[PDB]
């Protein structure tokens, strides 16, 4: 529904604002430098925490809007198939893509992908798929989604052989 979609949009927007504020603080060289962790590690932790909170909040918002005549709601509270995260990803937001915990690294020098200027850490440049499966993905986000899926496939293809050996 329209108003709920608008609230989703502004929720993601204020999350982006929090991220930008943190980046300004970091680039102004005053940070708490979180204990046990290096400066960049603290920065990455803060931003990933913010983005995942955004995704969770938006998904909860969509779910609590959703009508009782909605059939995917009917299945998901009826047990069998689907999930909260499935509803959230098909309607509200995909969320930040992942390559072993760290988000998408600068394979190209200083940048993730050749469509941006160097030395960014804004989430859309490094791979936050803000959008949703209903609206489809901007092509950069499409690429990062492909990265995450490929990681899952290769992990399956190695773990199956090793677990078979070690079962025998």
């Amino acid at each position: 529904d329209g108003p709920t979609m608008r609230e989703i949009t502004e929720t993601i927007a204020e999350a982006k604002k929090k991220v930008l504020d943190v980046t300004k603080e970091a680039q102004a060289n005053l940070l708490t430098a979180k204990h046990g962790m290096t400066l960049r590690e603290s920065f990455e932790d803060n931003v990933v925490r913010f983005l995942n909170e955004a995704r969770d909040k938006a998904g909860r918002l969509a779910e609590v809007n959703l009508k009782d005549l909605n059939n995917v709601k009917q299945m998901v509270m009826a047990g069998s198939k689907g999930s909260f995260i499935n509803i959230a990803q098909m309607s509200a937001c995909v969320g930040q893509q992942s390559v072993e915990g760290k988000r998408i690294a600068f394979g190209f020098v200083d940048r993730t992908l050749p469509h941006f200027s160097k030395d960014d850490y804004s989430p859309e440049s490094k791979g936050f798929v803000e959008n949703s499966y209903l609206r489809g993905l901007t092509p950069q986000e499409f690429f990062f989604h492909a990265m995450g899926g490929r990681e899952g496939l290769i992990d399956t293809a190695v773990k199956t052989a090793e677990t078979g050996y070690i079962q025998r």
Binding site: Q27, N29, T38, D110, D119
Partner: protein
């Protein structure tokens, strides 16, 4: 801690000691030229390094496209154009310092807030 080469044959002078007047004779080993050094400091280690964050300032950084652009002013020329980039010395340990270079004054300046 720098090296001084023998002027007579381009080989670095080595520390060797006056056995009686007690002076630093940087002597050549290739030829017999000898030289008196200036300070008793000879060897130097620096077990901790923290330098290199402003590397590779070429005279024409602005010719690259992929550097971003901003609107801070050069506090020498106050031109509103400038170019900024991350610290160059890529350790796991470095900072988020931005180094601003302006095309007009060709001058570098940072944004530290200590």
């Amino acid at each position: 801690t720098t090296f001084r080469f023998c002027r007579d044959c381009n080989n670095m002078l080595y520390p060797r000691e006056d056995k009686e007047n007690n002076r630093l004779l940087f002597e050549c080993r290739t030829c017999s030229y000898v030289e008196e050094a200036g300070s008793p400091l000879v060897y130097r280690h620096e077990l901790i390094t923290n330098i290199g964050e402003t590397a590779g300032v070429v005279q024409d950084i602005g010719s690259d496209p992929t550097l971003p652009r901003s609107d801070r002013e050069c506090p020498k020329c106050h031109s509103r154009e400038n170019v900024f980039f991350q610290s160059q010395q890529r350790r796991k340990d470095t900072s988020m310092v931005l180094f601003f270079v302006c095309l007009s004054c060709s001058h570098i300046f940072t944004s530290d807030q200590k």
